[PDB]
From a paper:
The nucleocapsid core is formed by the encapsidation of RNA by CP which consists of two domains: the amino-terminal domain that is involved in RNA binding and the carboxyl-terminal domain that possesses protease activity. The E2 glycoprotein interacts with the nucleocapsid complex via a hydrophobic pocket present in the carboxyl-terminal region of the CP that leads to budding of alphaviruses. Alphavirus CP possesses cis-autoproteolytic activity for its cleavage from the rest of the structural polyprotein during the viral infection process. Here, we report the high-resolution crystal structures of the post-cleavage state of the AVCP and dioxane-bound AVCP at 1.81 Å and 1.98 Å resolution respectively.
Considering these facts, we expressed, purified and crystallized the C-terminal domain (residues 110–267) of AVCP for our studies. The structure of AVCP was refined to 1.81 Å resolution with Rcryst value of 17.6% and Rfree value of 23.1%. 152 out of 158 residues have well defined electron density while electron density was missing at the N-terminus for the first six residues (110–115) in AVCP. The overall fold of AVCP (C-terminal domain) consists of two β-barrel sub-domains similar to crystal structures of other alphavirus CPs. The sub-domains I and II consist of six and eight β-strands respectively, joined via a long linker loop region comprising of eighteen residues (Leu172-Glu189). As a conserved feature of all the members of serine protease family, AVCP contains a catalytic triad formed of His144, Ser218 and Asp166 residues. Once cleaved, the mature CP does not cleave other CPs further in trans due to the binding of the C-terminal Trp267 residue at the P1 position near the active site. AVCP appears to be monomeric both in the crystal structure as well as in solution as observed by size-exclusion chromatography. Particularly, AVCP does not possess any helix in the structure, whereas CPs of other alphaviruses possess a 310 and/or an α-helix. The apo form of AVCP crystal structure reveals the presence of hydrophobic pocket composed of conserved residues on the surface of CP, which has also been reported in both the crystal structures of SCP and SFCP.
Author numbering: 116 to 267
The structure:
């Protein structure tokens, strides 16, 4: 288990955190507490520019974390709600497959490596373009935001 619900005070799921490469990572805009004893009270470092916040992964969860890959060839990827196309530098889904509460969910390749973290979606009709965080080969974060993105 490397994906954790972020809960508001009522216990409603607001979005998700992931364990990846020695960090716990979540979208900054997802407000609540991670529903995990080892993770609730960690010290987070916030980056407004990338809509992300991160903490050091507790040494108990060392090995139970996703790997990340910069290999994103065009084609199809996976996430909790089904297929994610990557084409023309954009990740898209059928409109209606994602919405509020899906921020922080990872997009995975078939080997189970993370290629992106979902921030939200811009409704283009049949397709919805996902606003995401990715990392390049230098480990630099990249936020991709589409016109009229809806935060999830």
């Amino acid at each position: 288990d490397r994906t954790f619900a972020v809960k508001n005070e009522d216990g409603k799921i607001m979005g998700y955190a992931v364990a990846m490469e020695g960090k716990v990572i979540k979208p900054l805009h997802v407000k609540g507490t991670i529903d995990h004893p080892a993770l609730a009270k960690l010290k987070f470092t916030k980056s407004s520019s990338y809509d992300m916040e991160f903490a050091k992964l507790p040494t108990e969860m060392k090995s139970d974390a996703f790997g990340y890959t910069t290999e994103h060839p065009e084609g199809f990827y996976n996430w909790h709600h089904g297929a994610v196309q990557f084409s023309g530098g954009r990740f898209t889904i059928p409109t209606g497959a994602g919405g509020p509460g899906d921020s922080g969910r990872p997009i995975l390749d078939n080997s189970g490596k993370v290629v992106a973290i979902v921030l939200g979606g811009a409704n283009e009709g049949a397709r919805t373009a996902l606003s995401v965080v990715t990392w390049n080969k230098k480990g630099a974060a990249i936020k991709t935001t589409h016109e009229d993105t809806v935060e999830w």
